[PDB]
Design an enzyme around this catalytic site. Structure first.
Site, short mmCIF file in Angstrom:
data_model
loop_
_atom_site.label_atom_id
_atom_site.label_comp_id
_atom_site.label_asym_id
_atom_site.label_seq_id
_atom_site.Cartn_x
_atom_site.Cartn_y
_atom_site.Cartn_z
N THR A 60 -1.50 0.09 129.08
CA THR A 60 -0.71 -1.07 129.51
C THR A 60 -0.21 -0.97 130.95
OG1 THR A 60 1.30 -0.10 128.52
CG2 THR A 60 0.06 -1.51 127.12
N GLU A 112 -1.26 -1.19 137.15
CA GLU A 112 -2.23 -0.81 138.17
C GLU A 112 -3.61 -0.56 137.55
OE1 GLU A 112 1.54 1.37 139.83
OE2 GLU A 112 0.88 0.60 137.88
N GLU A 131 8.02 15.16 138.01
CA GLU A 131 8.24 14.19 136.93
C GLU A 131 8.79 14.87 135.68
OE1 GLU A 131 5.16 11.62 134.86
OE2 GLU A 131 5.95 10.12 136.25
N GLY A 156 1.25 12.69 129.80
CA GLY A 156 0.31 12.28 130.84
C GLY A 156 0.05 13.37 131.86
N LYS A 167 9.82 -0.39 137.44
CA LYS A 167 8.86 -1.24 136.74
C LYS A 167 9.49 -2.58 136.38
CE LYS A 167 5.97 2.39 134.61
NZ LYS A 167 5.56 3.02 133.32
O1 LIG Z 1 -1.66 6.93 131.44
P1 LIG Z 1 -0.78 5.76 131.67
O2 LIG Z 1 -0.18 5.26 130.34
O3 LIG Z 1 -1.55 4.61 132.31
O4 LIG Z 1 0.45 6.21 132.61
C1 LIG Z 1 0.20 6.69 133.91
C2 LIG Z 1 1.41 7.45 134.44
O5 LIG Z 1 2.59 6.66 134.43
C3 LIG Z 1 3.70 7.45 133.99
O6 LIG Z 1 4.01 7.13 132.61
C4 LIG Z 1 4.94 7.14 134.82
O7 LIG Z 1 4.84 7.73 136.09
C5 LIG Z 1 3.21 8.88 134.07
O8 LIG Z 1 3.93 9.77 133.25
C6 LIG Z 1 1.78 8.67 133.61
O9 LIG Z 1 0.95 9.78 133.83
#
Ligand SMILES: O=P(O)(O)OC[C@H]1O[C@](O)(CO)[C@@H](O)[C@@H]1O
Ligand SMILES: O=P(O)(O)OC[C@H]1O[C@](O)(CO)[C@@H](O)[C@@H]1O
Lengths: 557, 557
Positions: B214, B217, B358, B272, B519
């Site tokens: 979700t 980007e 983070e 992540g 966000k």
């Molecule tokens: O893998 P996703 O859900 O696209 O998130 C990307 C990144 O955004 C975050 O949730 C916020 O920076 C990181 O922890 C994560 O690696």
């Protein structure tokens, strides 16, 4: 003590900070005064685009800014600036002028060093660059087998690498019809090896970039490239078609075997970390064209004139410098983050790591006194929005105060999907500094959790983790488009910020004595690595690490 | 107060520091004890290479290390570690297990979450990855025109980008026979636009990497890639040959329009920033082959077992963590520099910016109390030797204390010129930490000035500028070779360092609530940017920046 700490305007500022700084709350400052943005921003019209320096989200008031400006006057900033621009030998430990401003002096107004105008030689070298660029880019310049040049390889390190790399990356859209550009810098053999693997000796032109022409990494890399080239060409006269030098050292260039007509000269008053404007910029000019290189110089010249002619209270590099002093010497912030919301600018922070840290990472003042205050900060950062998903967690909710400069062009070079990507990019740029300023109060977070349907138990458990204390200061620097001209203005703006901070700290921004010891000790270790015999000549750590290297270098993996 | 500051072992450490730390001089510590290197280093034999963790150039005595180890114990590090490895839900704000260790659990010893062994599913997805890698790398997997895949494009940000990018960069020599790999991450349209410009839709395969599926980007970039692809393919059914997904979100993956058999799953207990070991590592496995990917996992597993089984006093990640605590909470050092002497490791620092910052850029403890002490540092760095010519001036002669980890492989991947480049690289690696420790005394500098023919006046003036105070602490981490296995061990080592520090601070290393506010505010700003209407809904800065954007976006330069 030192000049800054002895200064009565500084002690006044510090005392004010002690008594009053805890009462500065950005959210409340903005609510109380609708004119805050108007009072704490500079909208600069260059006639080739606008640069908006918005410093309103800083922990400052009118009073604070007045005290900071008064301090700059008290520290002799204007006189020191004039001395730089006039060719006075302000690099006092090396007895050198500091004249990167001469390199882009588009007006051609005489600037004298030792009673002699430097402009004729500046322009002679620029004319030589222009001629060379035309010959290479047009395809007229042929390699040793009679083929046009397809690839340019800049070999250099530090000031002979970072600028050209950063600028060619930043101005990539302006490189159509230019040869591919490669940068080899590290002594690590990986760097040259992987570069050479993708090249033909017949169509590659090497640019050996080194102010001194004696730096071990650069000369070793250059010799490796020359050996690779000669293995193919088998003719020493062919070197003249494939190797050029950017240097101040004519004798050492000749010694390496480069044609005198293949040397692009600069001067001792060009600091390495201020050198992209000189002959060192040749790879920029080859990649994007000499016209665009001239635009880059012109942008810097515009900012030079802004710095020279503008009252301190409305002077962009001075204000940026003063805000920096406020955070470094009153708040005690160790770092400064540079966060450009632009993928093309991905090497901008790395560039100013040298520009800032090699300049102002100093501890001895003009008087000979050791500083009893902080000097240059640690510069770091990554492009937005990537940084948001890496380290902004710490900026928002860590225990460190981190002044941030957010930078973005209004107009993107790639307005794909009818501007959708750039819309999102801009929204994030704007939101992040808003978020850092505003934060989120416990009662605001409470309401959000209540709306989400959290039980009294689950709400209370999660609540403190959702609170954003805010009051985190930022600069927002927004410009029409990242053109060669605007990039030139932006780099020069930070160069002058660095200058102003150096003067206020009473240090020499323009020497770099701190690199000598590492060079000396490496020369001693080099021959000790050969052979299997044990080294006992150093401390036990150095000895033990050498022992490990010797024991591990023959293992098969 | 908070758990750490209320802890009597911490109070003892802090009091000792206050009373005694000024007496700690690296030069003296080495002079007093020829066994210092032996006593303050760990030579780890993995059976696939050695990793030497040399922490002897730190400002620590035997008693300091004892106090630090005692603090780790009294902060419950051993118990917390065991809870992580057993699948306890130690991510307490999200009520999740933390099981990146399960992803690389090569022993296949059961690890249960809610009474259910996670290993069969870990291994199922690994088997799927292996089969997919065979199909793609062999050329059997055909694009929509029947051609073999030549290019892989990972689309993802943060944890879904940094690991795969860093590892594929680090393991480039192991990629023979693999497709080229590209990483698109920024929303900035430049990133996808410049990536797609050099690719053919016929031979390119997109990997959409997103834990949540979700992230704005990533989804926007993915949709741009799909549009670009469909422009050429003109057949919605062809998407199945060119798009795969790595996610925990089956529903959102289906909603995007990706084939159910084209999804490589992972789980909520994979953070992540700890995800490269899971399905997220697919681009690694495609690039270097599944065998090499298994070696990467095996190295991590080796380090997991070292972390699990080793008494704290000789436990590598624990010792690195404790030195970090010493510098952060006693000396007040804001930053930690990672300086790999390896061009292939050029993205290593950027990776641990997320992994460290983070994770530990936090301010709320397990009890909900605010910390009254520092937590995670700012992580930064560039590869050696380049950094020596950029910012080491400040490390040597600035006003900041900066703990540095120096890393290097004994064996280079490119032993060009009979090992000359690597000899020089190693000599610099050794010399820099030696220089940082030793400095250069006035008596040494004075003789150098005298020999250089400096006048008595010039000598007097220059002398303090040439002195290096030294006493700057470093770690040296040296390893046989940067293989997949060794890289895996090194990444895991730092993962566990970060874990140990988090436990000691009583914070949650495994959530990221601090990204939410930015966000939220970006979602509010996005729709406001369209059209010419004035935006007044924010503070005057945000409004003023938006006004500038709207005014400047139509200007023709
Ligand atoms: O893998 P996703 O859900 O696209 O998130 C990307 C990144 O955004 C975050 O949730 C916020 O920076 C990181 O922890 C994560 O690696
Ligand atoms: O251009 P040169 O003389 O090879 O020097 C390279 C770099 O080395 C330094 O002298 C040391 O950091 C830098 O100031 C300089 O830019």
């Amino acid at each position: 003590m030192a000049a800054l700490t002895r200064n009565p305007q500084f002690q006044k500022l510090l005392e004010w900070h002690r008594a009053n700084s805890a009462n500065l709350k950005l959210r409340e400052l903005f609510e109380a005064d609708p004119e805050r943005f108007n009072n704490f921003s500079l909208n600069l019209n260059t006639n080739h685009g606008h640069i908006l320096v918005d410093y309103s989200k800083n922990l400052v008031s009118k009073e604070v800014m007045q005290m900071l400006v008064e301090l700059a006057k008290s520290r002799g900033v204007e006189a020191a600036r004039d001395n730089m621009f006039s060719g006075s030998k302000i690099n006092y430990t090396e007895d050198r002028a500091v004249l990167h401003v001469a390199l882009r002096n588009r007006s051609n107004t005489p600037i004298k060093v030792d009673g002699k105008d430097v402009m004729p030689e500046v322009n002679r070298v620029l004319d030589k660059m222009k001629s060379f660029c035309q010959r290479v880019r047009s395809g007229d310049w042929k390699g040793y087998t009679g083929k046009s040049i397809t690839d340019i390889i800049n070999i250099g390190i530090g000031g002979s690498d970072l600028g050209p790399l950063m600028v060619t990356e930043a101005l990539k859209p302006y490189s159509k019809g230019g040869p591919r550009v490669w940068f080899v810098s590290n002594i690590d053999g990986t760097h040259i090896a992987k570069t050479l693997a993708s090249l033909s000796p017949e169509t590659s032109l090497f640019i050996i970039a080194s102010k001194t022409f004696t730096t071990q990494e650069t000369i070793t890399n250059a010799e490796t490239a020359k050996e690779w080239f000669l293995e193919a060409a088998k003719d020493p006269s062919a070197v003249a078609k494939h190797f050029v030098a950017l240097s101040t050292n004519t004798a050492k260039v000749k010694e390496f075997g480069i044609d005198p007509q293949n040397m692009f000269e600069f001067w001792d008053w060009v600091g390495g970390r201020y050198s992209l404007w000189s002959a060192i910029g040749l790879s920029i000019a080859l990649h994007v064209g000499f016209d665009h290189f001239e635009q880059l110089l012109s942008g810097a010249h515009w900012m030079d004139q802004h710095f020279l002619k503008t009252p301190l209270e409305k002077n962009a590099p001075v204000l940026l410098a003063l805000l920096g002093i406020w955070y470094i010497n009153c708040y005690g912030c160790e770092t400064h983050a540079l966060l450009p919301y632009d993928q093309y600018m991905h090497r901008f922070a790395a560039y100013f790591q040298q520009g800032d840290m090699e300049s102002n990472g100093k501890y001895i003042t003009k008087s000979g006194a050791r500083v009893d205050h902080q000097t240059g900060p640690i510069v770091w950062g990554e492009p937005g929005t990537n940084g948001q998903h890496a380290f902004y967690q710490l900026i928002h909710q860590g225990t460190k105060m981190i002044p941030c400069d957010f930078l973005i062009p209004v107009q993107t070079q790639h307005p794909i999907r009818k501007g959708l990507h750039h819309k999102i990019l801009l929204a994030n740029f704007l939101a992040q500094t808003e978020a850092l300023m505003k934060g989120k109060l416990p009662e605001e977070a409470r309401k959000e959790l209540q709306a989400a349907g959290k039980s009294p138990e689950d709400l209370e458990k999660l609540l403190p983790h959702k609170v954003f204390e805010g009051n985190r200061p930022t600069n927002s620097i927004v410009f029409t488009k990242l053109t060669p001209f605007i990039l030139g203005a932006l780099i020069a703006m930070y160069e002058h910020k660095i200058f102003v901070q150096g003067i206020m700290w009473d240090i020499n921004s323009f020497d770099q004595w701190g690199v000598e010891l590492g060079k000396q000790l490496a020369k001693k270790i080099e021959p000790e690595l050969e052979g299997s015999s044990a080294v006992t000549s150093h401390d036990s750590s150095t000895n033990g690490l050498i022992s490990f290297i010797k024991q591990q270098r023959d293992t098969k993996l």
